[PDB]
Design a protein around this ligand. Structure first.
Ligand SMILES: Nc1ncnc2c1ncn2[C@@H]1O[C@H](COP(=O)(O)O)[C@@H](O)[C@H]1O
Ligand SMILES: Nc1ncnc2c1ncn2[C@@H]1O[C@H](COP(=O)(O)O)[C@@H](O)[C@H]1O
Ligand SMILES: Nc1ncnc2c1ncn2[C@@H]1O[C@H](COP(=O)(O)O)[C@@H](O)[C@H]1O
Ligand SMILES: Nc1ncnc2c1ncn2[C@@H]1O[C@H](COP(=O)(O)O)[C@@H](O)[C@H]1O
Ligand SMILES: [Mg+2]
Ligand SMILES: [Mg+2]
Ligand SMILES: [Mg+2]
Ligand SMILES: [Mg+2]
Ligand SMILES: [Mg+2]
Ligand SMILES: [Mg+2]
Ligand SMILES: [Mg+2]
Ligand SMILES: [Mg+2]
Lengths: 202, 202, 202, 202, 202, 202, 202, 202
């Protein structure tokens, strides 16, 4: 029960009229984070749940007060390209909603690998690292070889052609777990940040 | 340089006359040497060369060198779905233990006879990290993931068989919902325990 | 001919102007159930066939009188998550239209497995069990091991990423038929309820 | 506990010295013991150990123990598309019979020479349940399913071959339309008959 | 050059403003048939090419005069279900535009196989048979075994789930070519009727 | 009954002692008997039993019985892309000839050295039907299909190899554009010639 | 840094309000080419960046002055069908923006192979050849065998059915690299022209 | 006719008694003869027949005839990801050198230990063309492609293994982003070097 975790509603298939109904049911108990919440659904709820915030790029709403970092360290969220940033903020906002400090390192993909070496120590000073990437997926391989903290890698569905909406990054990423890497499902920013938050709070 | 980890040998693509070559190249470590995926015919080839080495048959791993105490008092729980998983479970198990981790094995607890899984639930919940290894019924990872509030790393196993050579287990674990599961690639129990070991010792 | 079954029009590709034409053709003979009937098509037919009912969540229209249970027992329709409920009501409404009592057990997925043990006897007291699930598909494995009545399992296309719109549940579900489970096609709530109704009426 | 079923041995992953181990562990049942997928070399290994056991060559099943009468007077019809199916058909057949079911075999009736299938249509229609086993021409299940108003369980068989190792038969049976068909996974005649047997004895 | 064939514009990717431009270019020479012509594109061209006809269900426009049957026999176009009829009329209209008599046998799928035996001689009296079907694809197997004229089979992309938009019929159909069957690409009504017309005019 | 065709034996799944069983069951035909896919070790097993039979090594076909004249004066052209195709080309070739067809072989004319293909273009164009057999470079079927105004049946061959075991050739031929091509399934030269033979004799 | 290349913004996922922001950031330095720029996004930017040009068919905007050919030779862009022309102009416009002369040879697909032999010398007089094609993909095979300059082949996603949105051309094209051919990703006109420009400027 | 290239033998499908047949058919060239994919058992079969020939074991290539000087002073760099790549890297290497190219090998520089790759970056950058050969970690091609402003041809290697037999490496290289990469098909180091050699000598 009281395991110290917020509440997570799969806001993708649920109706705006329903999300109020689910929030207002658990509104007396416990922060309430909702993931994959369209901009058309937050507008329809804005006055019905007038405390909630909305992170546009992340498609996440939070009703309630995000805690202060309960752990002295931080989580590195590392992005290969700007197109990755929505699923990145889904991770970074759920990690912050679960009580973790988060240091963002966006747009340092391998096609300009000096950008990643520029922040290479910030990454190393995190307790966990989330690596997000599309197309090639190469970035998680690169970081996994270069840091000695747990790395959770999120493939994304960005790009085109034989990206197979994320399949090629997922395969690339799975093929480098021997370097200290685990992988979540495509676009699953929330899901990597939930295991990330657990790792970080130990 | 010195992150404490033992020396790893990928012994599937190295030769018997070439393994003894790097093992004794680092015979001044005082740190253990773990050799993964070493077929039983290749340990008989070196058994004269390294009389002291230990060989874990099911796990195809050979350890040379004095094991010191566990590094931290928590344990990694290794949960297996069926007997066909025992080998790749034992590769995770032996790697985790060589790396300094206490390991508690919880084998044959697939959801076909789920009472088995509640039998040893106290043990699973007590671990700092849970490695779930499952073949055809990769549904075990989700069942676990929704019963523990600790990190779960899932290892899909290939076992031949509308399981499409384990590809279904990999897909089933990725698409699992007990948020808190994170997936390595097929049969890679080593790398699971490598990420597990980092997670435990933090 | 007179085998005791209603009439089933694949209302997906057929036009609203046509469904009236098909209903009004067989309207003199025999209940008439139509499956995959959009809400935009029922409005266009509401006055042209003003007796029919419409189950919104199920996307099924029935013109005619649903029979009373011709069998003393009931069919358990068991759902893993709320997102599964449309295809669940397609099953539950066709099972009721074919003359079966139906006991619904919705939202008891494995990510909170206590909810399923809460209703575990209701399931067992059914003559047939329909298990519906998305993403992981785990639930059908779990129930198949726990009841000793025929279980028909419907994968659904809900979730995201490597769900492959239902493929991962279908594979998961097919891989547990040795526990007394058969599987229908993705989203095929109607089709599992048609075999279910046959089983139940013996 | 006591659901009446006989004892099942998955004899593909068990060893010859280990099979005689559980068979004689339950030699006080008075109930039959059915051992599926037992290669002809493994029955010669035990033929001394169990002189009374019967072995059904094509079906790779070994039955130890006195078969009592059929439990119910209806029969299961086992329909096979071609000769290449005889083995997995015979695994369904022998399992169904060991479990207490009268079984009527209707073999080699594929739609290439469909007059064969109308030859023995009276027999098929007379069954309480029909198990259809088909390789390349998995179209047989639909043809049957639209000629019988009784439950049909389809078993796709692998036979090597743009049949993609049976995957086409599995897909073809799932996507069948004679509503009333339900599919097990590849080559799993046992589990088909296990669901068939439940359906018959109800 | 003058091989006796009409002109065939892939009207799918081409613009309405362009199709007039392509027609009016070859309008002085030679009938002009255009395939995959949307209803939104024919309206935009109706006054610019005011002689052309439009077959709504077929999405084909013909500018010019369809010839009278230059061959005494006819082509049987055989459809399994009503959902198949668009791609059927794409075949039947291109076969008629190329000078062939066409006898249509729609909706006689295997789920009611008596309907096909009702027309079984009409099919046999054709010089070529086009078999169109979705979902299961079974129908082409059935007819191929029952007629001894060339059968060209068109899979369609109708149905749902693991139809894989036509892939399961294509596979089913390819797996019965030993009965005197060739297969075209999914939905390719025009393409089967072009080989059909050649066969018929010999 | 009597459509003129010779007797066919699928000799891949029949046994050597069982082949001589049906061959001499119909030794009163006066019509030829064609046995396809007969391995060279299985013809040596019967060579005593049938001293008169002919065996075409590359094609794995054995013909017993007096070949009468060709039934019609046109010929079938069998075009092969490379040497690796010679076997399945020769199965089409020998079947077509046993069935009563004049056959002109045009081998090794792949588009890598396309001048070879224009070398024997007069011959190809002169055929009533063209069977194109191609492995990796299945592009040959389209090239032919757009140079002949006669029916083209394409046979994809498996040859191991990012050709995905011939699946690419099958997909490439289906998606060919020289409208006038029709595809059989992988390696099935027999059935190609069976449809070819019907087309030629009409 | 100053390697002589323009600037390339993946204008697909980026917002119109952002592309101005990215252009106007690098507007002081260095031509600026933007690829996959919708017609709805260029209108919204037309007054904010009023120097840029827009190639409608190519979906490319260029802000800045395209250089004159810095190399005396030219690049042949060769198209199989008119449907290929968008991705062709994406290549031809990026090759021209990077300083290359470009000779276009559109619509000479293999279904009318005389059209390609008509321009066969123009192709040969280029220093590099880009071959673009859909459906069959055959054209790259044909040209690769016929020119002895580097050939870069772009599969496209045009056609239907088992085109698998470009997969069949990609496979066909990859299967002819032994003739002096490399392949880029589906629809990647820009990407083949970037390697093409490098080759040409040596 | 005379493009300068040496004579190539595809020695995987040619026989040992047939190889010596064309090698000595062109023994009046004064130009070298390169024989690719020649197993070590097939070179021992000819070693008497051609005493002067050289055989490169790892690369399965045999070269007969006097190598003249390099044709142009630039070199091709052949970069390999791991040891498992050495064979197909060496086929590219030896072909490039036989064709007249200076070749600099840069092996074992995968991104797991990326410092290795910066070790020999000066050499890589100095090449006119870079052939990148990579198995599981096909991410190497992108890393290179974004560090060199010269043409990169990538060769995916099959190595068994959630790498799906190299298919992931092929997909990963296609979907790479360091624009400047171009991909051959699986294991085809020869054809890579054939395109590489053309690119270098221009
Ligand atoms: N964005 C997300 N991705 C994956 N799983 C999620 C996401 N949001 C919530 N979940 C999980 O999905 C389940 C919700 O199931 P449902 O009852 O269908 O809402 C819970 O286990 C949530 O933690
Ligand atoms: N929702 C459904 N899913 C699958 N099959 C269905 C569905 N509704 C009807 N059918 C079956 O599809 C066939 C109707 O074919 P058609 O002539 O195309 O309407 C019949 O066998 C129906 O029982
Ligand atoms: N519906 C269709 N399906 C397949 N191929 C077609 C179709 N309509 C026309 N074609 C062929 O596609 C080619 C037209 O190429 P394009 O120049 O792109 O129009 C010709 O070979 C036509 O015969
Ligand atoms: N049309 C395109 N196709 C593929 N890659 C592209 C395209 N346009 C730009 N790129 C590359 O994609 C990268 C841009 O990454 P991003 O930061 O997400 O814009 C650079 O390497 C560009 O050269
Ligand atoms: Mg970027
Ligand atoms: Mg690491
Ligand atoms: Mg739920
Ligand atoms: Mg059960
Ligand atoms: Mg119908
Ligand atoms: Mg036929
Ligand atoms: Mg064209
Ligand atoms: Mg070339």
């Amino acid at each position: 029960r009281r395991n110290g975790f917020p509440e997570v509603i799969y806001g993708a298939g649920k109706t705006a009229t329903q999300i109020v109904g689910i929030v207002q049911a658990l509104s007396q108990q416990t922060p309430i984070l909702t993931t994959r919440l369209s901009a058309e659904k937050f507008a329809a709820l804005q006055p019905a749940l007038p405390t909630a915030v909305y992170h546009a790029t992340a498609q996440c709403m939070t009703v309630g007060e995000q805690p202060a970092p309960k752990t002295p360290g931080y989580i590195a969220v590392v992005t290969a390209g700007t197109s990755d940033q929505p699923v990145a903020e889904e991770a970074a906002v759920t990690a912050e909603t679960f009580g973790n400090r988060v240091e963002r390192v966006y747009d340092v993909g391998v096609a300009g690998i000096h950008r990643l070496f520029a922040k290479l120590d910030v990454i190393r000073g995190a307790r966990v690292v989330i690596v997000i990437a599309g197309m090639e997926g190469a970035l998680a391989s690169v970081v996994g070889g270069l840091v000695d903290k747990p790395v959770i890698a999120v493939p994304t569905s960005v790009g085109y052609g034989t990206s197979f909406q994320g399949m090629t990054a997922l395969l690339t990423m799975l093929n480098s777990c021997a370097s200290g890497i685990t992988v979540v499902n495509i676009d699953n920013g929330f899901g990597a940040a939930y295991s990330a938050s657990m790792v970080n709070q130990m």
